[PDB]
Design a protein around this ligand. Structure first.
Ligand SMILES: Cc1cncc(-c2cc3c(cn2)cnn3-c2cccc([C@H]3CNCCC3(F)F)n2)n1
Length: 273
């Protein structure tokens, strides 16, 4: 590992572990190098050859093919007390949290492009049998040259199933009222809730709910000027009853979602500066 990759600066660390910038030696390919302590892994999976491995590795492999809406796993290594994941790294890049912090509330044309791409990426995960469980601005990277968005951090994820989940380790302020109240949720409708939070954050520059009681009440106040169509879509995603939330098809067919820009157009108009 140490002879295959040159490690650069720490990009970030937290509950997910530590993530470093790196370069693949043979290639000069930019990579990210993620370390997770074994004692901090609660979800374990099995490789097709029967090897004990973090579920995150299983989810990443299921998701890591041609589609570039998800940051792909390139390699992985086991150490005595940790696992090391080698992930693709776009350059230049900025996560959506930082982007919104710097720019404030996004213009709706830009939010539409970004949200659409996140939907396509989440649909890809679900099609591969993977539930992300921590969709949020911090877990989305923007390839600033290509205008392409990429999902990161499958450390909180799960195999997608059609029955109830009773565990959750994603971000609480993005979690749905059914989780808060009953400690149970279904995968897709919980994902749509978090998408509603994400969309609100894009067009308002902050999340709509801070405390559990706000989530449970589910009343959405807009603190910035937001179009009626966008407001409608957000309020639909944030329906209290999960079965009242839109399907992915319904979100993408929503009037607010029509005429999305291509990623390169998005970059040329909004990112190149
Ligand atoms: C938080 C987290 C957890 N698990 C994996 C990754 C992760 C980050 C990545 C890449 C792959 N995985 C590739 N690039 N990259 C990256 C590059 C620049 C900045 C960031 C930020 C992502 N949000 C958290 C802070 C950060 F790491 F600087 N990530 N991040």
């Amino acid at each position: 590992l140490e002879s295959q990759y040159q490690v650069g600066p720490l990009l970030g660390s937290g509950g997910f572990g530590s993530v470093y910038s790196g370069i693949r030696v043979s290639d000069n390919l930019p990579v990210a190098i993620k370390h997770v302590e074994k004692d901090r892994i609660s979800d374990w999976g099995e490789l097709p050859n029967g090897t004990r491995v973090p579920m995150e590795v299983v989810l990443l492999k299921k998701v890591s093919s041609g589609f570039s809406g998800v940051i792909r796993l390139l390699d992985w290594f086991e150490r005595p007390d940790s696992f090391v994941l080698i992930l693709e790294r776009p350059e230049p890049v900025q996560d959506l949290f930082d982007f919104i912090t710097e720019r404030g509330a996004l213009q709706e044309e830009l939010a539409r492009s970004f949200f659409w791409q996140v939907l396509e990426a989440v649909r890809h995960c679900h099609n591969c049998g993977v539930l992300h469980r921590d969709i949020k601005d911090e877990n989305i990277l923007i390839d600033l040259n290509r205008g392409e968005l990429k999902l990161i951090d499958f450390g909180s994820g799960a195999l997608l199933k059609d029955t109830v989940y009773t565990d959750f380790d994603g971000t609480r302020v993005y979690s749905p009222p059914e989780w808060i109240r009953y400690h149970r949720y279904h995968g897709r409708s919980a994902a749509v809730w978090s998408l509603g939070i994400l969309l609100y954050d894009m067009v308002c520059g902050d999340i709509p709910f801070e405390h559990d009681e706000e989530i449970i009440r589910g009343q959405v106040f807009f603190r910035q000027r937001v179009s009626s169509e966008c407001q409608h879509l957000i309020r639909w995603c944030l329906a209290l009853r999960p079965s009242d939330r839109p399907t992915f098809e319904e979100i993408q067919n929503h009037p607010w979602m029509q005429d999305v820009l291509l990623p390169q157009e998005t970059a040329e108009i909004h990112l190149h500066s």
